[PDB]
Amino acid sequence: KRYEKLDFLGEGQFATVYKARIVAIKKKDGINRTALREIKLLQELSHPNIIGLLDAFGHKSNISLVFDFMETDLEVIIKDNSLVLTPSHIKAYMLMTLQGLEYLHQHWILHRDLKPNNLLLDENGVLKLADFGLAKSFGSPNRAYTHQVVTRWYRAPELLFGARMYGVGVDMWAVGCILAELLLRVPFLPGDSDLDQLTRIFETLGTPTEEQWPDMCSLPDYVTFKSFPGIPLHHIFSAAGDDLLDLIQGLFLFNPCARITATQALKMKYFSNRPGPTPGCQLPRP
Amino acid sequence: ALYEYQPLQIETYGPHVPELEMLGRLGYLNHVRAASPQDLAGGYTSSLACHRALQDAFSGLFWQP
Amino acid sequence: MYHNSSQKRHWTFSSEEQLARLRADANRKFRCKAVANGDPVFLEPHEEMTLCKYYEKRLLEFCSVFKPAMPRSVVGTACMYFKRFYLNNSVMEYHPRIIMLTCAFLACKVDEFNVSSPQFVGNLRESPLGQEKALEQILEYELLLIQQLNFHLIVHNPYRPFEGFLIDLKTRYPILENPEILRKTADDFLNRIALTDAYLLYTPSQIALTAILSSASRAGITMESYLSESLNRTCLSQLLDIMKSMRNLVKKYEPPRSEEVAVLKQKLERCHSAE
Numbered sequence: 001k002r003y004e005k006l007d008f009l010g011e012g013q014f015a016t017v018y019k020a021r022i023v024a025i026k027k028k029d030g031i032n033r034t035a036l037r038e039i040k041l042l043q044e045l046s047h048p049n050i051i052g053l054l055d056a057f058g059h060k061s062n063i064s065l066v067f068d069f070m071e072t073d074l075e076v077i078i079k080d081n082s083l084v085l086t087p088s089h090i091k092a093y094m095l096m097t098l099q100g101l102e103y104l105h106q107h108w109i110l111h112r113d114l115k116p117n118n119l120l121l122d123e124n125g126v127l128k129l130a131d132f133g134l135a136k137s138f139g140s141p142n143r144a145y146t147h148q149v150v151t152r153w154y155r156a157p158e159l160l161f162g163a164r165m166y167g168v169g170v171d172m173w174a175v176g177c178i179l180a181e182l183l184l185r186v187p188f189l190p191g192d193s194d195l196d197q198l199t200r201i202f203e204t205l206g207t208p209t210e211e212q213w214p215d216m217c218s219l220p221d222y223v224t225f226k227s228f229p230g231i232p233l234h235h236i237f238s239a240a241g242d243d244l245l246d247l248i249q250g251l252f253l254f255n256p257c258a259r260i261t262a263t264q265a266l267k268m269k270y271f272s273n274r275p276g277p278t279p280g281c282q283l284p285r286p
Numbered sequence: 287a288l289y290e291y292q293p294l295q296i297e298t299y300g301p302h303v304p305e306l307e308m309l310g311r312l313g314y315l316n317h318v319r320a321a322s323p324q325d326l327a328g329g330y331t332s333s334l335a336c337h338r339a340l341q342d343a344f345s346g347l348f349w350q351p
Numbered sequence: 352m353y354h355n356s357s358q359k360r361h362w363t364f365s366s367e368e369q370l371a372r373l374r375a376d377a378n379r380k381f382r383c384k385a386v387a388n389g390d391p392v393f394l395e396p397h398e399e400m401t402l403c404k405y406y407e408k409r410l411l412e413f414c415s416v417f418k419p420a421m422p423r424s425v426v427g428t429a430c431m432y433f434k435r436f437y438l439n440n441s442v443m444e445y446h447p448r449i450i451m452l453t454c455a456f457l458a459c460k461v462d463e464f465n466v467s468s469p470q471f472v473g474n475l476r477e478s479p480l481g482q483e484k485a486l487e488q489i490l491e492y493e494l495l496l497i498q499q500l501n502f503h504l505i506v507h508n509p510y511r512p513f514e515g516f517l518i519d520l521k522t523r524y525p526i527l528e529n530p531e532i533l534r535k536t537a538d539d540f541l542n543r544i545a546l547t548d549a550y551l552l553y554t555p556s557q558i559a560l561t562a563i564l565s566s567a568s569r570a571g572i573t574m575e576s577y578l579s580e581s582l583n584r585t586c587l588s589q590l591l592d593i594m595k596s597m598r599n600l601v602k603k604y605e606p607p608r609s610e611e612v613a614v615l616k617q618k619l620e621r622c623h624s625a626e
């Protein structure tokens with residue numbers, strides 16, 4: 001083919017990824033459903049902040065998926081002790097993530113696997129959502145989903161209570177967690193199980209009631225907790241300005257309907273106010 | 287330098303779709319199946335289903351191959 | 352969404368003459384490769400079209416009898432897969448009986464209708480050895496089908512556009528007091544449209560609107576006001592021409608005949624046994 005293998009990048013549980021000459025090639029049930037999901041969704045989408053399926057082909061069961069090669073991801077940036085995340089850098093990452101998510105949601109697709117490692121960065125500082133192996137189309141009535149999606153530290157409380165039907169909130173809450181991970185340089189709510197994740201959520205952000213979440217008791221796996229006051233958001237994020245606290249509070253609203261959407265988040269004063277988001281050229285290199 | 291929000295400009299080749307926030311007040315939501323409390327707790331409403339149905343009905347209606 | 356989908360960009364065609372050209376090209380290319388590899392056994396493009404129509408009906412029956420209940424979106428995706436595959440491939444190179452099962456299998460995967468492979472092949476009304484051999488054939492043709500679809504798997508059916516149009520009529524068209532009386536006949540017309548090549552020539556929204564308006568005209572409620580005011584006079588004229596052409600396509604459709612299908616089935620089996 002035109003794609004000659006150049007270097008090895010890594011191996012995943014469902015496929016192996018290597019850099020080919022510059023692109024990234026990802027390699028009785030038939031073809032893997034994760035690969036089919038990624039193919040069927042990335043062929044229907046085209047946005048600057050969404051990973052692009054440049055080409056696809058293969059032999060028998062194994063399929064080669066061609067993607068643009070990405071230099072790094074947000075997880076490496078966050079975990080990089082040497083790197084310093086100014087509010088401008090945080091704004092830029094948040095803006096690119098939210099623009100990609102807004103495009104994805106306008107086409108009725110939930111990513112459902114949002115985490116810093118799934119936000120890839122190229123050499124030009126353009127952030128792209130990757131790993132659509134869990135993504136699904138949303139908006140169809142009477143079509144139950146699964147509540148186990150999203151890595152636990154980023155899983156929304158409605159999911160942890162067993163929500164079969166949901167919307168963009170499951171991405172939005174994950175986005176908030178990423179934002180928290182961008183501000184603290186450490187994961188925000190590192191639970192050990194579903195109950196521990198719910199406990200950390202309800203300890204840091206207070207337990208919610210019917211006043212904040214009217215129909216929470218109807219979720220099949222709803223568990224009653226003790227009442228925690230919850231740390232005020234300004235104590236958790238001391239260096240954050242008022243607009244950033246407004247954005248975080250909107251992202252972390254317990255009611256997923258009231259939770260701010262990607263478009264609503266992009267219209268918030270946080271992105272409009274000074275300083276502006278850092279251009280991709282000057283974004284930190286890990 | 288400072289960011290300014292701009293709505294996504296994607297041509298639909300069809301009639302304009304009413305905004306999701308206006309579906310209830312324009313009478314659309316009275317012709318869709320109501321969302322159960324479980325669905326509402328999950329964050330899913332009948333507004334989303336109605337908006338998706340209308341967006342698909344109006345998409346590409348005026349487009350010539 | 353359809354308006355920037357792969358279906359609109361690559362799998363919607365200007366006229367049935369381009370479709371006939373693609374099918375004739377497939378027939379000619381297979382004839383060339385077969386005569387090079389080393390005759391009246393060959394099938395003409397019209398015979399191929401007759402066989403393809405017959406096996407599309409077979410795929411429809413298979414999906415209608417499928418257990419668990421296969422959603423109609425999956426069935427539409429599978430039928431579209433069949434049409435797209437046999438646009439650029441010959442039934443003499445790939446048997447339609449296997450390709451239709453592969454289409455249903457791939458559609459079940461793509462439409463997120465989780466069905467286990469043994470429970471998929473359990474619907475094939477054959478002996479267990481027959482089901483296992485058919486499963487091996489399906490798994491060997493899955494990648495071929497995906498390649499011939501050019502890795503364009505999402506198929507926009509007219510069913511959700513149909514629902515959106517019905518909601519819009521209920522909301523903004525009190526002239527049609529009960530838009531639900533139109534559902535039966537418009538669905539029948541949608542099926543008849545699916546029989547023809549309209550799915551490769553018109554947008555799903557146009558197909559749904561044409562079915563709805565055909566049902567309305569059949570029941571006598573002419574409702575041009577919905578197009579004129581609720582939905583550019585040139586745009587209205589183009590829309591009306593599109594619907595008229597689609598109705599003509601439904602009018603001129605000829606179902607395959609028993610004797611024709613029998614003769615073509617023996618000819619196709621002869622083609623596959625030889626070469």
Ligand SMILES: CC(C)c1cnn2c(NCc3ccccc3Br)cc(N[C@@H](CO)[C@H](O)CO)nc12
Pocket residue numbers: 009010011012015016017024025026051067068069070071072073076120121130131
């Ligand atoms: C779209 C996708 C196929 C892609 C594109 N680039 N890329 C890279 N490049 C360099 C890199 C190195 C370290 C941390 C982030 C990055 Br980015 C690695 C990688 N890792 C594979 C390993 O099997 C997994 O799929 C994880 O995504 N995947 C990709």
